[PDB]
């Protein structure tokens, strides 16, 4: 799930992901069965966003592939509680009983929680956290657990439910339960948006529980996990160093401190930022990650094992 | 990540005797075991006294010393963040060195490698004994501080003169348990003997 | 008549009381447990039983009382010890023999079997009387001759007046007939805790309370009938000030209402008060308890009794005032009363307003404080009484943001602002002159002018000196005392002397145990004259510090001068010291 | 800033640590000022 | 002469509550016995009674109840308790069933739990002193007979171990100054491992004669956990006032008791009180604590030492703040000291006792006790400040007195604070140890110590 | 130079850090209490009223039949 | 309005304004007829108000509406109403300009909160009723100059 707030371009990045969706195995991947057959479910979206998504998919040339289910804000609230279920059923049929890889985009889970709260209030049940229905966790589990690969069929369902933090928070029941259920979390940060980076992804809270199984020798270079661990360590140490330099003073910072600040700046400038109509290969992207890593000395790269260091430090 | 005052958490910590509180910061730090060594606690300590005594009587005291070192490091981390490392003394320097050595060699277990997949108790006790012994020898060395030298000078000297032992204390993690307990015990005993030789020749040279 | 129907914890629902009134006490069950009527749904009522409700069986009879929560006043109210629900603890212990309070004790508040020497006034047997008339006087004790008066809200033509003789409370001594019917009146009478005693006209406060401590008497005067708040919760300093008030204050009698405090503190108070004794101007020793009514409520006691204890005490004080005596009422802990209020509100499920307190906390607190003031009595002969409240604030965490504290500060006129820091600064009075304020200073205009025309100017100059001192403290902390001007240095030294000697009264020493108004005013005059005549002289700072050191010693001797040496003698000594300081300062310069 | 008790505890801990650090820095500044005054006397 | 009426009108079973239909004149808290259809016997307490309808909360859960085949016998007695002198030396379940493999107690008299409150006139100020054994409490924040002091702690701190230590090492100071002492140990909601620890500690105590141990497990019904403090205080009151024995009551993890009160309040379907916990908790804990005191009439007294766990490792929680408001003391368990592995993790600086002056005297305790208490407290604060100074300045700028304070703090933490779990120190021995700590300072340096008392002991 | 830097750090702390954190704590306490506790109690009261008038309607129906 | 916390001389400021009030005059019959509401005041403050208004000679043109704290709390809400009704009658239907003064606007608020809590209504911020915006609007939003009439509030 993508975690965003009001104003952050979650819709734009969703459209980007839909156009850029592709296989990666050894950079090899007609593929009509391999066609992602995107199922897009938008609930309580402004008419401007609806026209935006419609035009984006029409111009994408995948109009023979994608399928859109819309429940606008001016549409009745009750309809919104069924729309993602309809999308899940259509995806399940087109994937399992039709043998096609299917990707699912659920939009504004907060809007779905709003409909759930409206229904509960109308029926006058006991509340949960923040007046929500107590069974909202069960509803979100049922709306999420309907995806994943299946042994008996060649199909599969991968879902990317964008979520709107109400007050740009996580303790809210909806994002909290979504984190409890979903096996990942991608963060879009208002601080990144303030500096005008088109993809505002905050890599620090971002995490995939199945990332280790996702990365493989065929999928990526053997040192990809080392690169990820090094990037985590460098970013965390750099944030701590930036705080230390701020409290003690810019001059008082050590040499490695300025190195970490330079790494943070270069990373957030070149690496995170990306174009809007531009996709990109994985292997040279990992090479650029090695460039950012080799900015740091070999000794400082304690997280990376020496074998992968000798493999890809110089390049 | 959430508050540990949640009713389920509060109810559990009331009855449960051992809490292996994982740290979100450690997880972000990519420290794989991610176990916090401050919030976590095991109330079962008093029962295992006989077991530890029959296994290794010295293990209790070295464990307490390691806990004290970790607590001191955590306590003065705020001070060094505020004031700075300039005021840190030789005792503080060796304390921080031992704390970093623990955080890297000891508490970190990758478990994706044969040497780190499983750590038997005999290897764990020897590594902790080596770290604590190095800490004790450094304490004695900086405490001697005689012959128009020593203290922080002794700390820097043992950092450079005895850098090989310090470096291979880290490699002690990489010692493969599959090689067999007698071989690993012999290797660790030899390392301990060399460490005793260290800070003894450094004692003889009197800086 | 009336049987319980639904007994759910504190609340008990019983049928049969078709005629029950709202807020009427009622007895429940065989044990005669006491409860109040809240909800009168249909033919049934709602009883919140104060004591434990365990063991109640359905159809247990419920007996109506035809009276709201009322305190039985009259002679003999003084001296004894009473609970929050007006239960005489000492007599209960004596009669019951056992130590614990039995569940269902029914001992009357005042023993009607005791005989009091009743002396009637010269009022005619065929005369006409109205409410508030002082128709007689009974010698309930020494030093507190009880001026019994005809019950308020009663007017009639008197039919019979009893002669001077030993009578019991149950015995009737009065009877009146306004209409055809004639109704007899006894010495004992009753009044609801909630409704205030009728008063002919509230009066503007004119005369101050003399606490016996120089700091409060001089810096921050409190009028008769003026509300005072003490921020005391630890160290028993509030109890110390209460003891000082009991021993030396102008109050003809004092009522201490201890509610919701720890049992040990209550025991300490109940042993400490009898030990204290109050010296008459005649000098012979008389115990304070003979003039003091003490009401104690521990945490073990029922919450509703703790809440109503405050109104009980204030009603006793109102009776004393209507009897024409100045009286002071001390609340041990208003915050404990607020806790009782929040507990009751939670029990009755009211909507919380701020930090759990019910919305009506401000109204109840304001009413209770406003029930105290200088008052023109009802009836004749015309006399004026006064109730002054010194209710103590005990904020949890020592934060004024507490709603009860804010409400009290909004209502209270004088806040003496005791600080634990001064106690940590080895100051016995521990009265923070800075954070404390007085709002009755203008009220003392006539009294101060009559006593001493320059006293107002002296007090204003002292306040200005305190402000200059608090500024000069941080000024000295900045650079040092030397950088200050000579006149500023004198001002700082004189402020230090004022704080050390005048403001800080030990009260442990016999000479400083009681500080009269005359001695305090003369000491202030000596200090202000020395400071003034030193400030005009500058000459140097160090040079005048050495050459006027004798003047400083003489000024400090005013603290040595004590009423124990005699009031005229102390006044003469203070005048001599002031003259000596004047001569030393003038001649040297 | 989530009103959850976790944020309240974090802010309380931050305030307490800030107070302790302020006290320590004040003590250090006072000592350094005293040493500077002595050095100034020697230089005078 | 009155026989029970066995109703069989079970109508409606909801949660932990069972409702009878037609009961002729029930009592409110009449204890009640329930026979299952299978024949299993389970007890229960009658809750709020309406007109001819009574709702009952039962122990051991509500499983197995059938509307047609369950019968409810009404005893009509409001939870009486048998209490007697021989109750000492035995371990009792939450309700009071003997678990020591011993005969049921032969009652001297039957007593009502939640006994009627003491007439406040009869209360007297605390006097004398009692040896906790732990020198830190014995010196810094002493406890006198009749003073109710709680002990705030957090989960993971050895509160229970310290309580057991106090149980073992408790004894009157008057023995040193020259068998009426008794302990009623009630443990509420303790875990199985801690239960075994307490049972073994009692088995090898050697002091069974003076100790009675009320035990209520976690698996025990919540209402039993509620009533355990009540029966404990009732037995203590009998053994103290009716028997003329000084009594020291220890209540452990009263947070469990508060949670059980919350459970029963929710069972009443009443609205939850402020901050989640019930509003009536103040009155309940007052009734629990206020039973401690000194009766003028009876020589015996009661001392209350609740071990109240502070949730979230702070006293801002409603229960710690409420019990601090009610009580007159606060001894603390510092998490750092346990982390630094000092078996008594007592936080001496937060530790305080309101009536410390009354406990210390010439006849009871030694005259220098209060003086050395104040001197050690001030010197420890100075030592902490000097430790901070050494951290910030590098320890070179410190003078000789600063090093003196540093070494004093180090020796204090090494010797006085750390005590053997089985090591016992008389208060005289504790004062001697504190004095040995004090000798390292110069005579003039002990500013707090009064003159002619310093030379009395500093001579050594 | 060192004393100036230290004094600046201390003054900055006293004037900004605490002076901003204390309002943060106050706002957090105010929001937490006056929103969560108030609305939870209101929800509970509304549910209690719902049950109460449901029982009242049941009693009215029983009286009717 | 005048914003002023507890302990400030705002009451004395209001008394000074009321006694020194007057038109710019850059007449007397249509001059400022001051209405002085007093929502929930202390008895001493009430006596101060009475004395200051009687001595100032403004009693020829000033009406007081005193409501002490001892009065029933509901009687407090109707006060700053009755006051505005009289002001409307005097200004619009009688002509003379009115300068209404309300003291302790907060006490009115408290009076509302207490009454609302008694009524068991939906609470706004800090436990105050949610419709208090309306019920203040009904008090504040009366002063103004109706066109057809020469009065002014």
From Swiss-Prot, chain B:
Keyword list, A-Z: ATP-binding, Hydrogen ion transport, Ion transport, Nucleotide-binding, Translocase, Transport
GO molecular function per UniProt: ATP binding; ATP hydrolysis activity; proton-transporting ATPase activity, rotational mechanism
Keyword Phosphoprotein belongs to the record: no
A biological process from GO: ATP metabolic process
Cellular component terms per the entry's GO annotation: plant-type vacuole; proton-transporting V-type ATPase, V1 domain
Superkingdom per UniProt: Eukaryota
Subunit structure as annotated in this protein's UniProt entry: V-ATPase is a heteromultimeric enzyme composed of a peripheral catalytic V1 complex (main components: subunits A, B, C, D, E, and F) attached to an integral membrane V0 proton pore complex (main component: the proteolipid protein).
Protein family per UniProt: Belongs to the ATPase alpha/beta chains family.
Role of this protein: Catalytic subunit of the peripheral V1 complex of vacuolar ATPase. V-ATPase vacuolar ATPase is responsible for acidifying a variety of intracellular compartments in eukaryotic cells.
Protein name: V-type proton ATPase catalytic subunit A
Organism: Citrus unshiu (Satsuma mandarin)
Taxonomic lineage of the native organism: Eukaryota, Viridiplantae, Streptophyta, Embryophyta, Tracheophyta
Residues of the full protein shown: 417 to 623 of 623
UniProtKB/Swiss-Prot annotation, chain C:
Class in the EC hierarchy, top level: translocase
CDD domains: ATP-synt_V_A-type_alpha_C, ATP-synt_V_A-type_alpha_N, V_A-ATPase_A
Binding site for ATP: 232-239
Catalytic activity: ATP + H2O + 4 H(+)(in) = ADP + phosphate + 5 H(+)(out)
Any single GO BP term: ATP metabolic process
Keyword terms of this UniProt record: ATP-binding, Hydrogen ion transport, Ion transport, Nucleotide-binding, Translocase, Transport
GO cellular component: plant-type vacuole; proton-transporting V-type ATPase, V1 domain
GO MF terms held by the record: ATP binding; ATP hydrolysis activity; proton-transporting ATPase activity, rotational mechanism
Gene3D superfamilies: 2.40.30.20, 2.40.50.100, Bovine Mitochondrial F1-atpase, Atp Synthase Beta Chain, Chain D, domain 3, P-loop containing nucleotide triphosphate hydrolases
Keyword check for ATP-binding: yes
EC numbers: 7.1.2.2
Cross-referenced InterPro entries: ATP-synt_VA_C, ATP-synth_a_Xtn, ATP_synth_asu-like_sf, ATPase_a/bsu_AS, ATPase_F1/V1/A1_a/bsu_N, ATPase_F1/V1/A1_a/bsu_N_sf, ATPase_F1/V1/A1_a/bsu_nucl-bd, ATPase_F1/V1_b/a_C
Oligomer status and interactors: V-ATPase is a heteromultimeric enzyme composed of a peripheral catalytic V1 complex (main components: subunits A, B, C, D, E, and F) attached to an integral membrane V0 proton pore complex (main component: the proteolipid protein).
PANTHER family: H(+)-TRANSPORTING TWO-SECTOR ATPASE, V-TYPE PROTON ATPASE CATALYTIC SUBUNIT A
Function summary: Catalytic subunit of the peripheral V1 complex of vacuolar ATPase. V-ATPase vacuolar ATPase is responsible for acidifying a variety of intracellular compartments in eukaryotic cells.
Entry's family note: Belongs to the ATPase alpha/beta chains family.
Name this protein carries in UniProt: V-type proton ATPase catalytic subunit A
Organism annotation: Citrus unshiu
